[PDB]
Structure formats: C-alpha cells, structure tokens
Nucleic acid binder design. Structure first.
Ligand SMILES: [Zn+2]
Lengths: 140, 128, 101, 142
RNA sequence: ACAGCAGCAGGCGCGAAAAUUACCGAAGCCUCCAAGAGGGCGGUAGUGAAGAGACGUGAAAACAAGUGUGUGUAAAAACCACAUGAGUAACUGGAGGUCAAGGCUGGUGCCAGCAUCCGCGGUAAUACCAGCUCCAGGAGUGUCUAUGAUGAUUGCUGCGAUUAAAAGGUCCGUAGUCGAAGAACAGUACUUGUUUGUAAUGUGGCUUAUCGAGAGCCGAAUAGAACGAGAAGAGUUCAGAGUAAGGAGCGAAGGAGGGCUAGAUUAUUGAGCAGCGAGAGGUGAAAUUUGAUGACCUGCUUAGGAGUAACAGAGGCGAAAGCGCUAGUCAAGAACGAAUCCGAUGAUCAAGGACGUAGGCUGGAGGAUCGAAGACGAUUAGAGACCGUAGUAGUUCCAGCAGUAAACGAUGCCUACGCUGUUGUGGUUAUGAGCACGGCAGAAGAGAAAUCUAGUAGGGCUUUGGGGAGAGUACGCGCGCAA
RNA sequence: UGAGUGCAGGGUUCUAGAUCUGAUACAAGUCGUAACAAGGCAGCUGUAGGAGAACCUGUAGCUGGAUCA
C-alpha cells in the first residue's frame, strides 16, 4: 500500500481502522441521544416523585441521599444525587428541580455512589448552595 | 527483487559499521552511478571502479572517514521548491552540513543548488 | 514462558512421529519424546554361578543373556527416579547413561 | 524462487565473455547450416539441435559460426512449427497425467500435480496470444 | 363575508437556552408624473457580566465616580473644555499529594459529610462542620456540556503482531497494487517562466483619533485556468545482448513422496483334538468374576481381521495435513553437473476454485484387538469418578458429505546485506573446496526482561490488534442430511 | 395539467404483551471443592457421549511439564 499510485487503497484501509476506537465508534454507531444530560442538553428540568437512600461501595460505610425525578423532556424516570450537608431537607415531594452531570467522559458513576449519574443543582428556581447555607429562602 | 538504490545504501552502511574501507556492490543502474559520482564530488567516497561483466553490472568503491550515514527514499516524492526545506529539516542532522539529493531536468543536484537554479524535482536520497 | 529451546523433544524438520506405550502405565507417548532405558541381564543370578560350575554336564558353559529396550512417559520416569529435577544451568548438560543389568 | 514449489536451486551454465570463430572445428559454415536443417526436418526440438552440435560436431552455443539464432534460421527456411515448442511440451505432460488418472482414479497426488500443470499452460498461452503467435480462440487439446 | 408576522416592534407555547408594542425633514442607498413627496431598507439610542481594549479603589504632603455652563446631534443623551463641591470605592475559589499556600483552636465520632483521581472519618481528623491566619487570579472568579489539543492511544511524516491485544490450516487464482542490464526515442502528466485568478477576513507595512484595541491608505498572495521551456526520473521501442529473474529440455544419480498388482516372519483372540488333575485372573491391598460340562500350562491342527518391534537418530521425504515388511508396475516433481533452447513470459493477492489428523454423518463390505454409552464389584460422609470385571457405537475397507485443533518452531510470502568454530544428508571436485537442505556452540548488536525465526533498512504485496467485561454473543444473510 | 380522497400492499422507525431465557451487581445464604504445589487422577486445545453442580469418560494433538540427558 506504500506505492506512489496507491492512494485509493490506502485511504479505504485507514478509514476502516478507526472503528476500533471506542470514541469514534459510539458517535458513529451507538445511541448518543438516550440521556437526560449529554449530547442533547447541559441541564434538565424534572419533578420530584420519591425520596431515596443508597449504600456506598466498599470499603466506605455510608448512606447517600438520592431523589427520584420524572424528566419533562423524555418522560423517563431517573435517579439523581443531592450534594450538600443538610440538602435533603430543602426538597419536598412534587418540587421542581434542575439536574446536572457528574463530569466524566461518558455518563459514568463517580466516587463511591453505585449507579447514579446526575446531581441536583436548583430547587424551585433557586441555588441549592444558598438554600443549605441559609443565604436565601424558599419562594413560598 | 530489491530496489537497486536501496541495496546500494545498505551495503555501504553495514560495511562502514563493520569498519571496512572498501566494498563490492552487485547490481547497478544508471541513477546508482550518478548517486556515487555525487558522493565523490563532496568527498564522502574516494575511488570508484566499474566492472562491465555483461550481467547487470558491479562497482568497487573506497570509503572515507567522513561518511556517517546515507539512505534512499521510496517512493520518490514530487516537490516544489517551497517543499524541499521541510524534507531537509526532517532528514539532515544540522543546518550547517550534509546533503539532500534531488533529481531534476538538470541532473542530480543538492538542496543548495535548488535555490541557485530555482527548481524543484523528485526526492532521491541523502548523506551526512 | 518457554522453558526449553527444543520443546522437550527431539523432533526437527518433521510434521508427525510414531507413538509408543509406557512400560509402567501403558500411556501413549511420542517416540521422539519418550525416556529410553537399555538392559542386558544374565538369565542366571551371580549368586548361583558357583553351583552352575558343578551342575552343568558340559566342559565349559557360557550363561545366556537377555536384552531389552524399555520406554517411559515423563511422569513414570520422574516417579521411578530415572531422571530428577535440575537447576537452570544444569538443564543444558547432555550425557549418555549406563546400560542396566 | 521456483513458481509452483519452494525450490531455490542454482544450477545453470555460464555464457562466454566473447565468442570468436571456432577455428579448431572440422567443417565449413555451409556444412553446419546443412546439418541443422536436416536435423530439423527429421522432427527434433531446437534444444536437442543445440545438444548434438556441441556433442558430435564440436560447436559451442551454435551461433559463433552462423551470426543467427536457431529458431530464426528455421523461420528463414520455413520449417516453423504450428505451436511454440514450450507450450507444446506443457500440453504433453497434461495429457500424460490425465491418462494416468483415467485408470488410477484414487491418486490425490496426481490430482494435485494436474491443477498446477494446467495453471502453467494458460499463463504461457496468454503470453503467446499477445505477441500474435497463436490464434485468439486457441484452446487446449483436452 | 374576510384572512396567512420564516418584514419591524409585540404576545403565547416549547425548552437548559435569546432585547423596546422606543426616536428619525440627519448620514448610506432605492422609488416616482417631482427645485418636492415616500421608505420599520437603513441609521439613533434603550436592554443583557456570551466576546475584545484602556483605567479607579490612595499618596507622602494632598486621590475616580458628583454638579453647572458650553459643546456635541435630526433632536438628543454619553464623549471632550472650563468652573464649582468633596473624600466614597472587592469579591470568587482554595490551603493531604498532583498543585501555590496551616499537623493552629473548638465540635463530630465509618455517623454526618468530603472527594475529577488517589483517598479521608470507628473520641489524639493539617482532608467533614465552623472561627482565625495564609495562597491564587482579580471586576471578576467557580460549575456543567460539546470540540481541538494532551496522543507516536489511529501512526503519510510516525505505533505494533515469539511470550502483553494481534500472521489467515495449506495451495491455486481474477480484479487491484508493484516490476532487469545495454543502446536509443518522444513529450501528456513532472518541474519551472510569463500572464490571468482574492471584496471582506488573514498576511507584510505606514498614517491619524490622549493611549490601546479601532479607522484610513499601500504591497504581495492560495487553489484553478492560457501560452512557452527543460528533459534526470517515469514512459515507448530495438536486437552482432543474453540476471546468484522465470519457463522448456539433456546427463548421471538419491529419498518411510503418491496410486496399483502379487507375496511374507511373528503376535492377540476363537474353535477342534491330546496330555495333567486343582486352582487361575487382578491389585497398594482385595472383591466382582471364571474352573471336575476338566480351567491354567504344554503339544499338534486350523479360521479370521488389524499391524509392521528391535535396527531407528536433535536421520530422510512431502504444499501442509502426513509417510516405516518384500518384489514388480504407472505418472509427475525437487536438487546437482555443464559453452542446450525461448526472451520478460514475473512478485503478492479481495472474489472464485482444490486438499485438510482425529472425532462425526449417508450408503455398501466386514468384525481379531481396544473401547464412549450402559451394567456391576470395591473405596468413601457421599462417589455418580479415579481402580477391577465385563460390554455396545465406533476403531478397518470402498463411494461421498463435513471443514474444526496448543492445524505451534505460538514467529506471513518473495528479495537483500551481514562473525567464527564444529557436526550431519545428497551430488560434484584443480582434493584446496563449493552448491542445496539442516543441527549445535559462542560473539557482536538488539530487547522491559526471558532470550534471539527478534541484527541492519522509507524494498515490494496481502492478513491483522487498539484497557478489562458483556462477546466471538443477539438480529439478518450464505453454505450443510444433521451435528 | 392536476389538488384531494377511496382500496390493497410494501419500506422505515418507535411502543404494548401472558410467559420464557441471557447478562451484571449482589457484606459473608445452601451444597460440594473443579483450578493454582506431582493441588492429592499433571494441566490445556479440537471432537463425541454422559451428568445436582463445578465437571467426568473415550479418541487424536500440544508443553505454556514434573524430562533440553
Ligand atoms: Zn507411564
């Protein structure tokens, strides 16, 4: 394939090789639009339906606080994590929450939380960081 | 069959590494003659004899102490005068010495003569 | 990792070889790999030759010998102690063993 | 290397540096030229013509005296064969193998040799029917 | 009956996502029968930390932002000039390592939380929650999401395939990519001149807004096309030329290479008959089991179906799978010797075609030995297994199907350049040596090492890998009687 | 020249479904112990039977073997 007039053979061969890369393959041949946050959108709105808790992976020993969210844009139901110290207390059933990604290349689990892929950002139009640290109050 | 200009290069490179002063090279073509004659002009090789054996051809050559390395490029890429310095920087060790040889309508010439004559050509080989 | 340069057998420049059967357990082993042992044993024991000298009718007598070639598989040769495990530099030494009696 | 098998033999014979004229010989030009054309009409292949000239009449390579090659002389005399002698010897070997297999059908080794032989025939045919030495629709005797 | 905002404002929805139902006889342009009329085209401001410049938040004597006039414009506001007051003006992320900066004080005790990654916390936490001091950037700083770089982890330059992931089981073969020396010839590619071909952007500059982005003027330019020129490489032809390129042929010889015909020395079983009169077999040790219907062992007769011991090897032959008794017969091949003939006929290979141990399947022949399945005897907690007794399909042959192996020297095929000693096999020999096919032991280089079919290298062509898993699995398709 | 609309079919993409059958994670549940030491019958590859389950048995192969002899 290294001959001077071999360009056609060379091009067709090298194109076919790239499908061995996971990155190129997923963009070409996988379902890249299945996710609430990803290629489609940076943030997602949804309504809280259940409060939930999950164990951390070994060797850690903890209960992590999680929320069941119905996503407006897809009608899927997903699990999200609630970040801050007393955070679970700032959320009621049937509140609206905005939800965000964990920051890995694909949608992947982070740290010791098994199988959860998003986190809460805002509750009832206001920043959760401000709610928890008592800098601002619920809209009421 | 091997390329004759490739065979020439490996034969002299190995013999130089083994610290021999002379070699016999077994299959010769028209551009092989012109390549060797170029290395003689720049004082990399000293003495050349050609044997007219009626079977292809063969040469006997004396090596100088100045030759570090030589090589052929395959395939022989076409180059504009704008392109030659790219190949010069890729192949040669220093901006101060060594030769990159190019075939042209004016015979074999080096990368300096290309500037003088204002001509590109096809890339052939190098030595330093 | 590769333990021996010859793969533990004497086959070179061939596809396939005849098999033989182990003396101790009847397992099949390739002829070029089997451990071989030669035996030359008198029919009459050394502890009887002094009686033979008064028992025989002939003026002189030569005792008949019996001849054998025996074959062993690796497991049997190691267990019967025809061969033993050896160090990484000893493995390379090749010398002919004695004929048994 | 060899074309149908893994051979790398090197047995050949050296061609001389210069050819001269064979003055040690005991015949004229015209006699040698007569000897060739007789051997030709009797039906000998041109490689055998060469062997006889060397062995019996004492002339090496059969050209130093004539300034002309054996097959060209046969075309000048009009004695040219219908098929080139190489292609002709390939058809013969094929026929032989098919005549063996016709009575000893079980021989897988002979079957193997036939498919090799047959391939070589068509590769040679395509050479000659490009140089206009055979009619375009020529086909094997099979 | 009427009606169609992917015109300008504006509203509702949808979403993670985007401004005023504002002024306009002025600037740039367009339209008419016009010393005039029209234009949401266009211009002017308002709104918003998408982007980009220049500067405030003090000095050691003495500091923005305000205000009033003038300007500015279509009218304005801002900008600039002079004159008045004065003394206002920092946050975001961090402080165990990567990675700049605290083993500080108090709470909490695998809780609550933190942490991109590695990891912290079970009562002595520089990592959680706070106080206090430090660090970094600073009118800005954190997070999420796509992409370029990191990355020689996509490799033209420039990676890998003995053992880490990775050379097709072996051949033939089309399309495709790649192809001697010598003597000559021609100009379409190739390279280059002149002329065309670029507003903005970008590039090399100079000049004016306090400065700096900004604005204004200059010069050269890509790919593409027109006409000339040069002939090294590539291309075409020739034969007083004949490759350590190929094919055809000659001579003497070598080999478990293959098909067929006709024979062979023993051995293992089975029957017949004769002798003898009590055990044989099997194991680590024993039991199933067989024997007075005479076993076992020793004779003589016979009947079958497999196989070729020892010699026999780091020996030979074959494309691989594979091939071992003796004669006769039938085709083709490899190597060697040499002054035979033809002359580029060649390398590698998608598609397509032929062979392929064993076990398996369809039909016929046959059936000694061995033995999946099945059945017993022992051993064990239990053995369905390992061991012993027995026993069927298969194991052999002819005519076919099938298509897999740790089909491995785990090392593709042609072709090169390469140190020494020793030992083989077959020819030839000036007896000094060579040519083809091997084994072995060092060296030098190489490599993560072990080691070396792995040294040197932009020679040609095909196959093939890209962190573990799921997975050589699902769906579709092609072959097969099925597997 | 033809908009619309009947009636059969196809081509695409989604979605329902009694029941069955894969995979993955299961702090540590039940039964054995198949592999790694000659792992207690040396291991592994192809093929064919059998079996609670790892697996066991015949046949040809390989050393990555417990032998460069
Ligand atoms: Zn044994």
């Amino acid at each position: 394939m290294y001959g001077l007039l071999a360009a056609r053979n060379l091009k067709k061969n090298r194109h076919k090789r790239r499908y061995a890369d996971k990155d190129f393959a997923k963009k070409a041949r996988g379902d890249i639009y299945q996710n609430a946050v990803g290629y489609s959108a940076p943030h997602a709105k949804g309504i809280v339906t259940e409060k939930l808790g999950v164990e951390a992976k070994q060797p850690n020993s903890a209960i992590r606080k999680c929320v069941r969210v119905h996503i407006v844009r897809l009608n899927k139901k997903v699990i999200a994590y609630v970040p801050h110290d007393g955070g679970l207390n700032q959320i009621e059933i049937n509140d609206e929450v905005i939800v965000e990604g964990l920051g890995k290349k694909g949608c992947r689990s982070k740290g010791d939380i098994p199988g959860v892929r998003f986190r809460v950002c805002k509750v009832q139009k206001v920043s959760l960081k401000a709610l928890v640290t008592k800098k601002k109050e619920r809209p009421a | 069959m091997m390329d004759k200009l490739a065979n020439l290069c490996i034969t002299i490179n190995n013999a130089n590494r083994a610290q021999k002063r002379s070699v016999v090279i077994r299959r010769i073509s028209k551009v092989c003659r012109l390549f060797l004659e170029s290395m003689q002009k720049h004082g990399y090789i000293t003495d050349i004899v050609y044997i007219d054996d009626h079977r292809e051809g063969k040469a006997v050559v004396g090596l100088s102490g100045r030759l570090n390395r030589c090589g052929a490029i395959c395939p022989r890429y076409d180059v504009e005068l704008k392109d030659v310095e790219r190949y010069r920087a890729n192949l040669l060790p220093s901006r101060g010495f060594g030769h990159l040889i190019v075939t042209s309508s004016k015979g074999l010439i080096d990368h300096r003569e290309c500037i003088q004559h204002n001509t590109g050509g096809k890339i052939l080989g190098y030595f330093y | 990792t590769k333990k021996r340069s010859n793969n533990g057998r004497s086959k070179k420049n061939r596809g396939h070889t005849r098999c033989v059967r182990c003396e101790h357990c009847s397992a099949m082993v390739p002829n070029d790999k089997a451990i071989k042992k030669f035996v030359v044993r008198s029919v009459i024991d050394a502890a009887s030759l002094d009686d033979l000298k008064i028992a025989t009718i002939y003026e002189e007598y030569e005792v008949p010998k019996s001849y054998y070639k025996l074959n062993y598989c690796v497991s049997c040769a190691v267990h019967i102690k025809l061969v033993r495990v050896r160090s990484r530099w000893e493995r390379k030494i090749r010398k002919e063993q004695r004929v048994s009696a | 290397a060899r074309m149908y098998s893994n051979g790398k033999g090197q047995s050949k014979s050296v061609t001389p540096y210069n050819l001269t004229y064979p003055t040690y010989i005991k015949h004229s030009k015209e006699e040698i030229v007569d000897v060739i054309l007789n051997l030709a009409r009797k039906g000998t292949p041109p490689s055998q013509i060469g062997n006889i000239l060397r062995d019996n009449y004492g002339v090496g390579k059969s050209f130093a005296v004539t300034k002309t090659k054996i097959l060209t002389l046969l075309k000048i005399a009009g004695l040219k064969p219908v098929i080139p002698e190489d292609l002709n010897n390939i058809v013969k070997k094929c026929v032989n193998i098919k005549a063996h297999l016709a009575k000893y059908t079980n021989d897988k080794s002979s079957k193997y040799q036939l498919i090799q032989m047959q391939s070589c025939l068509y590769r040679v045919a395509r050479y000659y029917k490009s140089k206009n030495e055979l009619p375009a629709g020529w086909k094997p005797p099979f």
